[PDB]
Amino acid sequence: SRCTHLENRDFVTGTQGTTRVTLVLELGGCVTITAEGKPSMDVWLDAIYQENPAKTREYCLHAKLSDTKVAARCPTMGPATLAEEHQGGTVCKRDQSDRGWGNHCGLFGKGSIVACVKAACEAKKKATGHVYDANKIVYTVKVEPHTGDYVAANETHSGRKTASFTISSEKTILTMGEYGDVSLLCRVASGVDLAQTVILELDKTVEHLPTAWQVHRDWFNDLALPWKHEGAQNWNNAERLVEFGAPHAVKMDVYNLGDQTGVLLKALAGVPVAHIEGTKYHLKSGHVTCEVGLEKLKMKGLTYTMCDKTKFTWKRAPTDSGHDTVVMEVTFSGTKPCRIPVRAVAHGSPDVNVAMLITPNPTIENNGGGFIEMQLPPGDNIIYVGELSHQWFQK
């Protein structure tokens, strides 16, 4: 059962008459649903994402400066000017330098000086923000029936089904193989509010970093870095990463404040990560409430005869699942298919069956069955699968 793979697992149980079940599925969680006369089902919210979300601003973390130009005039010669002062994509500073005979001016005094640099951004040194549209966000829910077959996490359960939901398409009917149809009504509106969320992306090809972060819109909009719209050619406020030195005669130095990535990363510690897979921008945390309709589900193998009580052996002896249940797997050497005669008694009371089965109507099919998950009361018990027995101390 898929839910046995994780630590975060909930059990939902429907009694007599319970045909519908309302669950709050959370990313990283898993729910096992059990109900009288119904095959058990594992359900979980698998992903929350939007393909190609809209991009808000792009910020530059490392300025690439080039073509530094300086123009200086002697004290009586008027303002110094450069064509660059009027071009976008350049950062300039006008100042005054001390001039005199030493640097070829007729008078000793203040002379106009102006320096400009072309400012661009280093390749792969942008920080881009993305915003979600509640109407385009997709919630993916997976359902897997309890078939008495154990499948590891790196393996694929042939009976697992997937359902996708958007605000405009909240209901799906899934056919669970021979178990019947299950209906899922999940409301995206009951999900995570995304108004103040921005998915921040740096360079997703960097190997030792998460591919994205989920940050607050107000924090993102206040970053003190050069910015522009995707598609725009030049950067606004490029001066944020450039400093000019005090001028001396006909020269003025231009300083680059360096790569701000390290600075940003310190700010991002403790911020939740997100994930990008191609064009899909995923949230790594979130939840949604769904209504599961069980009325069309039917159990499998109810009319088989009981398996020969003499032909069972333990493939995997009873073991603690970590969810206060016991898991085990048996092998049957008799004729299939048949119902597995499972029960358990408390040490000293051989007459009362104390086993509460999670796995519905355990059966050995022609090519499956054998895995059983059950709950037992605290203390010493003995598990029986026909004549096959096993001691079990619960707790």
Q: Note whether 154 binds ligand NAG by CB under 6 A.
A: yes
**Site for ligand NAG (CB under 6 A): how many residues?**
3
> Whose Cβ is closer to ligand NAG: residue 31's or residue 151's?
151
Encoding tokens for residue 154?
């790196």
How far is it, in rounded angstroms, from Cα 374 to Cα 386? 16
Least Å from the CB of residue 368 to ligand NAG: 17
Least Å from the CB of residue 161 to ligand NAG: 20
Which residues make beta-bridge pairs with 107?
none
> Whose Cβ is closer to ligand NAG: residue 152's or residue 269's?
152
- Check: CB of residue 280 under 8 Å from CB of residue 211: no
Task: Show the binding pattern over residues 95-134: x = contacts ligand NAG (CB under 6 A), - = does not.
Answer: ----------------------------------------
Encoding tokens for residue 328?
């085990």
> Whose Cβ is closer to ligand NAG: residue 152's or residue 195's?
152
Least Å from the CB of residue 158 to ligand NAG: 13
| Segment lying near ligand NAG (by CB under 6 A), choices 136-144, 152-160, 176-184, 380-388 | 152-160
User: Of residues 7-26, which lie at the interface with ligand NAG (CB under 6 A)?
Assistant: none
| Segment lying near ligand NAG (by CB under 6 A), choices 18-26, 117-125, 149-157, 224-232 | 149-157
> Whose Cβ is closer to ligand NAG: residue 157's or residue 251's?
157
> Whose Cβ is closer to ligand NAG: residue 123's or residue 152's?
152
Q: Which residue is nearest to ligand NAG (CB)?
A: 154
- In the block, tokens 């499948």 appear at 151
| Segment lying near ligand NAG (by CB under 6 A), choices 7-15, 108-116, 150-158, 282-290 | 150-158
> Whose Cβ is closer to ligand NAG: residue 156's or residue 303's?
156
- Check: CB of residue 41 under 8 Å from CB of residue 182: yes
According to CB under 6 A, which one of 155, 207, 218, 222 is a site residue for ligand NAG? 155
Least Å from the CB of residue 5 to ligand NAG: 13
State the number of CA atoms in the 13 A half-sphere of 6 facing the CB: 16
> Whose Cβ is closer to ligand NAG: residue 156's or residue 366's?
156
> Whose Cβ is closer to ligand NAG: residue 58's or residue 149's?
149
Task: Show the binding pattern over residues 238-267: x = contacts ligand NAG (CB under 6 A), - = does not.
Answer: ------------------------------
> Whose Cβ is closer to ligand NAG: residue 149's or residue 201's?
149
CA 242 vs CA 226, 254, 257, 263, 374: distances in Å: 10, 7, 6, 16, 67
| Segment lying near ligand NAG (by CB under 6 A), choices 147-155, 197-205, 241-249, 272-280 | 147-155
Rounded to a whole number of angstroms, the distance between the first and last alpha carbons of the chain is 22
Least Å from the CB of residue 154 to ligand NAG: 4
| Segment lying near ligand NAG (by CB under 6 A), choices 98-106, 148-156, 224-232, 346-354 | 148-156
Least Å from the CB of residue 318 to ligand NAG: 23
| Segment lying near ligand NAG (by CB under 6 A), choices 8-16, 151-159, 273-281, 384-392 | 151-159
> Whose Cβ is closer to ligand NAG: residue 151's or residue 354's?
151
Residues binding ligand NAG (CB under 6 A): 152, 154-155
